[PDB]
């Protein structure tokens, strides 16, 4: 039978999406700080890797109190990364190479150094109600003691309420004292979010990653007898009143009203896309919430449509070095079971807030984990360095940028996952001409670097390239999936599609060898051909699997190419 | 192609297992108490239902403090239920009808009225260490102020330690004060469990349901500097020191040593089966525990073999009327994902310790839930009443006899704890006490809805829960259900499918709208389903009758509506 024809998917439905951490990608100007001209000089890497889309962690004007998540001007670039001109050059050169470029910002809050906040604190007309401003809770017992409006706890610990001496009122900060929560019931705030997005789309951005969406909306005092209602207490003895966990965020997180804002953002993008043509512009949402609240980002049963997808953090929250093959299967099945019909699945192993993939799992698992990301249906999300198996870097107390004491600092710091990218075995691993990098270069850069992996016959990077290339096959863009564990140690993932080749992942996620009966794997006729193997596998690409009995070493993964069903 | 032959499975791998609660099944003698002559009189019901095996809740000599789970003599029958002769007649008649009979074995504890306990408390030679006896915790603050050995909390509320004046020591009770925990590090106790099991297997029992196994073994004071270690505090402020939930049972539940006892029981039973021949005798284990601790009952990575299966309580613990179709799928997949290869799956929708299936779910979901039970691979477990969709009976504070409610509850809270509503007499018919008894004075009150919900009515009427139950047990004879693959996914938040398929054999498809709203689905999305297909079973409220042809790929299901479709072989 001739292979069936498939309808082309819109780019966002099956893109390889790469998270750039711009501070650590490429320093062009010898200051030891990654920058936009650096990213521009290495756009060819994305084409070479088979990446379709890049997003950058925030690069907007920022006092850098929360390392760029505290945005003071939503319409300009942070000077350390370059200029608006550099950003426009990045869009031009990326688009010339066929890449999509997404911007990351946080709708929930602005820097207290934003003009929005300066003007709002000063009660300037049109800005007075831009943020959540509240009087103290009346204290007729001790009128000399000022009470905050409610017991709400910041994500950073302490009160979510900060006193303004100038305004003689409290403002809400769900995050840092310097990150002020916008009032999303203010039409002027909703308009300003449309204005920010329109500005960047007009420059040519292909879409946005929007952070902290669960925190957008808090209880309306109108619904609680004119006061901000206390969050219910967790009743968990390990948390005091100043500690995150003391409260259940009933009135401060996952309010149904936040989804109406998201659906409004999707309506705005759909209208923008209709009125401009070219490549669909998208929003990918970030929110840590239960499965029900996560899936409401896609849309609802009443037919509302939201984010092109909410990010899937299940591999970060629910898989670990302790996970066995049955855990891998059951967690993979959660998104695929709960996602609404027609939703696009996405998969994430890493970001700048977590241990790097081989450090969080094991060094021998890098290839199998990259295969899972690339072979599951939908969108593969790669964190900078995963394509070469970068490990966490050693960072000393004295070299720490993410500052609590010299003995315990390593339990808190996210710096080890943010060390400069290993291009090669040149000075500072080719990240910089300078030895004075903003974080130290990991000690293993001479063993683990991109240039070496391109030179050597087998490598993480070559496996990454073979997998992004495989995603062009109809079986991966349009094929069904079947996933089950064969043992506590080994699971299979089968992509199949009538008249098209079958692709099978077999992955021993354990620390011991395992033998499995390939007769148990659906749609796998033998002999089959090894398409990809883990760098430590005895089997090379092109190796024939002929026996139904297969021994997999600890961490060993194979992708088999088998005849069509 | 001619249908392929399948190798017949051992009876226990795909049986329909029915839990009898003897006290509430059939009263033969007008005392308002179910009895063995009552069960004997309705053994034909199990044949009529398509039940392969019955397990009875305990029928051994008992003060009835925990309605039989407090056993004073493990070798004889509770007088209210009848005699050893009645039991022997029950086995004979059940076996003549081709039924298997399992007994409820309660190894964790004995009644404080057992000879074991009386002799142990008296320190008679060979019985001194039969139970967990402990000195008071030394009190260096105020010497001789009597402290319990540890903070351990009973499942029925209060301290797990009871002072004996006679012995001047505390004894352990994980359950009621009257249920005394055996010492499973004592070889004589382990020997006694083999003695009990051999006695009843020799009578001809087809096996045992094993009670409360997570609680068998607690921390050895030899590993904790000669004391019983405190369980970690939960740190949940809603629980004071006398309330269940105040502690995390780290030292009192799921100890790795308990599984070695289970594997020893299986070894004994395998040897018994080998030496005696006839039908395989089985053990099914009861334990509420996390997935890892539950799966260790089957066996371990080192090749130990335990229970033929541990009961799957997921439809009790993890699904309810709050659940959507995606929850149903994701929970059904948990057992099938985590069960060891070669394991037999089982499905439990109710028991005497939990609210009835239609009460936890909804009245309009009864058929869909029985279909899930019967159509999923492996063993279907039915609790007394599920085959006719019995609802929880009303039981006042005044009528409540459950020790757990009497101990943890008061006239306002008792409903949070009481198991009595799931223990109300079985609805045979519309006669006095729904035909459970000739007496109006029943040990628990008969549910108010017996005129509407009773077996006789469901056997007469054209469409009923019971007729649906019979059609589903019959369907389990098909190779597709005994040997077929499964595929399960949600079509929406409201509707899911379960497909049983087997090349050259008919394809069977459940479609179930678990929601309170109508749902329209595309049957083109269902694997191995070619139309037209035939309705084999429908919910009693479905517009479709058995024999209806499904021809359109757009299917609207009403709230709670379930269909089984019969479709051509793949
Ligand atoms: Ca907010
Ligand atoms: Ca015990
Ligand atoms: Mg630079
Ligand atoms: Mg009686
Ligand atoms: Mg299939």
């Amino acid at each position: 039978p001739p292979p069936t024809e498939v309808i082309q998917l819109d780019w966002w439905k099956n893109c390889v999406l790469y998270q750039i951490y711009p501070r650590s990608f490429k320093d062009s100007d010898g200051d030891g700080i990654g920058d936009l001209k650096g990213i521009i000089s290495e756009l060819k890497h994305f084409v070479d890797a088979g990446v379709d889309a890049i997003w950058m962690s925030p690069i907007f004007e920022s006092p850098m109190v929360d390392f760029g998540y505290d945005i003071s001007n939503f319409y300009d670039i942070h000077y350390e990364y370059g200029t608006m001109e550099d950003f426009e050059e990045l869009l031009d050169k990326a688009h010339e190479l066929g890449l999509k470029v997404l911007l990351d910002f946080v709708p929930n809050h602005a820097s207290n150094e934003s003009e929005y906040f300066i003007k709002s604190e000063a009660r300037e007309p049109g800005y007075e109600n831009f943020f959540i401003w509240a009087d103290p809770l009346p204290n007729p017992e001790n009128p000399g003691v000022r009470l905050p409006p409610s017991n709400w706890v910041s994500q950073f610990g302490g009160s979510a309420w900060e006193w303004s001496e100038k305004r003689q009122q409290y403002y809400l900060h769900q995050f840092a004292i310097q990150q002020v929560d916008f009032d999303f019931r203010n039409p002027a705030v909703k308009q300003e979010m449309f204005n920010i997005m329109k500005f960047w789309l007009d420059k040519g951005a292909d879409g946005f990653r929007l952070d902290a969406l669960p925190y957008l909306i808090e209880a309306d005092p109108a619904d609680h007898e004119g006061r901000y209602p206390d969050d219910p207490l967790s009743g968990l003895t390990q948390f005091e009143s100043h500690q995150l966990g003391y409260t259940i965020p009933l009135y401060t997180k996952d309010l149904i009203e936040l989804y109406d804002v998201v659906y409004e953002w999707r309506e705005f993008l759909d209208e923008y896309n209709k009125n401009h043509g070219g490549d669909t512009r998208v929003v990918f949402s970030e929110g840590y919430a239960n499965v029900s609240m996560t899936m409401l980002y896609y849309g609802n049963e009443d037919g509302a449509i939201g984010a092109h997808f909410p990010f899937n953090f299940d591999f970060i929250t629910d898989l670990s070095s302790k996970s066995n093959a049955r855990d891998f299967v059951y967690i993979i099945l959660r998104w695929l079971t709960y996602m609404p019909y027609g939703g696009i699945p996405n998969w994430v192993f890493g970001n700048h807030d977590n241990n790097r993939m081989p450090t969080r799992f094991r060094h021998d698992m890098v290839d199998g984990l990259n295969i899972i990301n690339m072979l599951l249906p939908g969108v593969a999300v790669t964190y900078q360095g995963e394509e070469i198996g970068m490990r966490d870097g050693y960072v000393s107390w004295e070299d720490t940028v993410d500052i609590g004491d010299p003995d315990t600092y390593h339990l808190y710091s996210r710096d080890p996952a943010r060390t400069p990218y290993h291009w090669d075995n040149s000075t500072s691993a080719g990240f910089s001409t300078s030895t004075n990098t903003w974080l130290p270069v990991a000690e293993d850069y001479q063993e683990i670097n991109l240039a070496k992996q391109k030179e050597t016959a087998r490598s993480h990077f070559k496996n990454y390239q073979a997998l992004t290339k495989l995603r062009k096959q109809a079986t991966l863009s349009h094929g069904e999936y079947d996933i089950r564990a064969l043992s506590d140690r080994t699971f299979y993932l089968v992509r199949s599609l009538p008249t098209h080749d079958t692709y099978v992942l077999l992955f021993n996620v354990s620390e011991r060898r395992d033998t499995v009966d390939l007769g148990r794997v659906p749609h796998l006729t033998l002999p089959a051909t090894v398409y990809v193997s883990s760098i430590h596998s005895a089997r090379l690409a092109g190796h024939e699997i002929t026996s139904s009995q297969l021994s997999l070493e600890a961490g060993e993964a194979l992708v088999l190419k088998a005849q069509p069903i």
Side-chain angles (χ1 to χ4, degrees), chain A residues 480-482 484 496 522-523:
Chain A
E480 256 291 6
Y481 75 86
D482 288 290
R484 297 187 180 161
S496 66
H523 308 310

Side-chain angles (χ1 to χ4, degrees), chain A residues 278-448:
Chain A
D279 297 327
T280 302
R281 301 150 192 90
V282 299
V283 49
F284 304 147
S285 54
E286 174 217 59
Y288 294 80
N290 68 30
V291 293
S292 185
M293 292 302 102
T294 299
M295 292 316 175
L296 272 187
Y297 286 100
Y298 278 108
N300 68 24
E301 66 194 335
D302 291 343
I305 307 290
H308 291 84
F309 57 75
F311 276 93
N312 173 10
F313 295 121
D314 287 359
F315 295 172
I316 292 175
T317 60
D318 286 73
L319 287 177
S320 74
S321 65
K322 315 265 220 188
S323 302
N324 73 21
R326 299 181 178 289
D327 300 317
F328 270 81
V329 168
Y330 195 56
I331 297 306
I332 286 167
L333 281 170
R334 198 164 74 198
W335 200 271
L336 289 168
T337 298
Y338 277 100
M339 177 184 42
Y341 171 51
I344 296 306
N346 67 99
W347 314 100
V348 191
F349 275 107
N351 59 36
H352 57 288
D353 291 329
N354 286 273
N355 297 294
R356 288 177 167 140
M357 173 188 286
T359 304
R360 190 159 75 86
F361 294 92
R362 289 171 279 285
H363 298 177
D364 64 8
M365 283 173 77
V366 164
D367 294 308
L369 296 170
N370 280 337
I371 298 161
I372 293 171
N373 198 5
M374 297 296 169
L375 188 62
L376 285 168
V379 164
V381 184
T382 296
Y383 174 55
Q384 179 169 303
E386 282 180 346
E387 75 276 31
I388 58 170
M390 291 188 59
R391 299 158 190 181
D392 279 11
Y394 180 72
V395 183
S396 77
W397 174 229
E398 297 80 29
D399 285 353
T400 295
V401 176
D402 188 31
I403 294 105
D405 68 290
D407 305 303
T408 64
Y409 80 94
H410 66 279
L411 299 169
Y412 306 94
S413 187
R414 293 160 300 162
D415 287 338
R418 304 177 177 184
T419 68
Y421 188 89
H422 299 177
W423 295 98
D424 64 26
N425 64 353
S426 75
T427 308
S428 290
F431 162 75
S432 187
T433 55
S434 174
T435 56
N436 188 39
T437 57
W438 78 276
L439 283 177
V441 173
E443 298 189 308
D444 53 16
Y445 79 89
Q446 302 217 69
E447 290 74 62
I448 302 170

Side-chain angles (χ1 to χ4, degrees), chain A residues 193-212:
Chain A
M193 288 297 146
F194 297 128
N195 291 349
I196 293 161
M197 286 193 285
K198 182 178 143 48
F199 172 88
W200 293 111
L201 295 179
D202 289 339
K203 293 286 186 181
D206 296 289
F208 307 100
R209 165 169 168 139
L210 296 185
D211 301 326

